[PDB]
Amino acid sequence: EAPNQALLRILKETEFKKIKVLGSGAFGTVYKGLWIPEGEKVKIPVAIKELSPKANKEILDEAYVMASVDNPHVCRLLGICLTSTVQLITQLMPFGCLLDYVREHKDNIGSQYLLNWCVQIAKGMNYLEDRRLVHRDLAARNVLVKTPQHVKITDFGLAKLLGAEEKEYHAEKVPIKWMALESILHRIYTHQSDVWSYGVTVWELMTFGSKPYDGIPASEISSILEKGERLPQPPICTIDVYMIMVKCWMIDADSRPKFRELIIEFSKMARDPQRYLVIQGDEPTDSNFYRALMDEEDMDDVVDADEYLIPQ
């Protein structure tokens, strides 16, 4: 489409420090860290990722994808550090992923927060659809929590930018339980295939972190969805909400709702949240807070990445 004039920033290894490991899985290792631009008098909480020539190619692909997106509900890239293994510096989300958050605070999450998260996730995905970007890994684990009122979409290791005349992406290890049926059978990925993963993501939030298709091997899932079986209706979900999930899981990809329409539907429900989610008993940004998770004492000059918009 248009020329991608995004600026790729290079960060010095001495400007930032690692603090603790947040996760060490197949992707690599994600660190909690602090970035201090030299001479800026600013401390920025960051997340650092590192995955050989093949490792440097994949993370530079992720840096290329993240540098092309800038949206309040999409994690922003801060830059890369050119070590032997090039590292990915992103904005740190202090409260973690939404999957662990709904499990830890299951008895304290109201209907207003669940519906608000659905609106924000759809806003981020609709922006990615505007950017011709297919995420291919939309899940509750990849929706991180900046604040309980603000979430962002993350993990672009599988994200693929589309050509202007490219309607679908043809793939050649994936999360089977979140993929659309056409993605499992024909390796076809589309913005409508992300709507399917969006439906599973909402199902994770409404079940407060239940594993979809729990106890079922991923090999048998292709035959389950093909027979017409879907995820069950969560107990707190009214039919208004569960109908939206079923629409995201329809066989016809074009029949599924668009992220633009999902923003509207969940926004209407957010006006009257107790009418669409039935939860019993439906009724923190400080300098001290950052001192704990960053394990630092002097946090007067802390600035979140959303408030740091600095050309180098």
Binding residues for ATP: 22-30, 49, 90-91, 155
Of the candidates 152, 168, 148, the one whose C-alpha atom is nearest the C-alpha of residue 90 is 152
Query: For residues 276 and 202, what is the distance between their CA atoms, to the nearest angstrom?
Result: 14
- Is residue 146 at the binding interface for ligand R28, with CB under 6 A as the rule? no
Helix 111-130 and helix 259-271: axis angle, to 10°? 160
Query: For residues 71 and 124, what is the distance between their CA atoms, to the nearest angstrom?
Result: 7
Q: How far is the CB of 99 from ligand R28 (least distance, A)?
A: 5
- Is residue 32 at the binding interface for ligand R28, with CB under 6 A as the rule? yes
- Is residue 77 at the binding interface for ligand R28, with CB under 6 A as the rule? no
- Is residue 305 at the binding interface for ligand R28, with CB under 6 A as the rule? no
309 contacts: CB under 8 Å, gap ≥ 6: none
- Is residue 92 at the binding interface for ligand R28, with CB under 6 A as the rule? yes
- Is residue 48 at the binding interface for ligand R28, with CB under 6 A as the rule? yes
Give CA separation, 147 vs 99, 251, 267, in Å: 14, 35, 19
- Is residue 100 at the binding interface for ligand R28, with CB under 6 A as the rule? yes
Q: Applying CB under 6 A, which of residues 144, 188, 195, 245 lies at the interface with ligand R28? A: 144
Catalytic residues: 137
Query: For residues 212 and 89, what is the distance between their CA atoms, to the nearest angstrom?
Result: 31
- Is residue 47 at the binding interface for ligand R28, with CB under 6 A as the rule? yes
Of the candidates 73, 77, 75, 53, the one whose C-alpha atom is nearest the C-alpha of residue 63 is 77
Of the candidates 50, 61, 55, the one whose C-alpha atom is nearest the C-alpha of residue 87 is 50
Residue number, 92 or 248, with CB nearest to ligand R28: 92
Q: Applying CB under 6 A, which of residues 96, 110, 148, 209 lies at the interface with ligand R28? A: 96
Instruction: Give the sign of the dihedral formed by CA 180, CA 181, CA 182, CA 188.
Output: positive
Q: Are 155 and 142 in contact (CB under 8 A)?
A: yes
- Is residue 90 at the binding interface for ligand R28, with CB under 6 A as the rule? yes
- Is residue 75 at the binding interface for ligand R28, with CB under 6 A as the rule? yes
Determine the residue with CB nearest ligand R28. Answer: 23
Query: For residues 25 and 46, what is the distance between their CA atoms, to the nearest angstrom?
Result: 19
Q: List the x/- string, 242-271, binding to ligand R28 by CB under 6 A.
A: ------------------------------
Tell me the window of 46-54, 170-178, 181-189, 208-216 that interacts with ligand R28 (CB under 6 A). Answer: 46-54
Q: List the x/- string, 152-191, binding to ligand R28 by CB under 6 A.
A: --xx------------------------------------
Tokens of 292: 């704990």
What is the binding site for ligand R28 (CB under 6 A)?
22-23, 27, 30, 32, 47-49, 75, 88, 90, 92-94, 96-97, 99-100, 141, 144, 154-155, 293
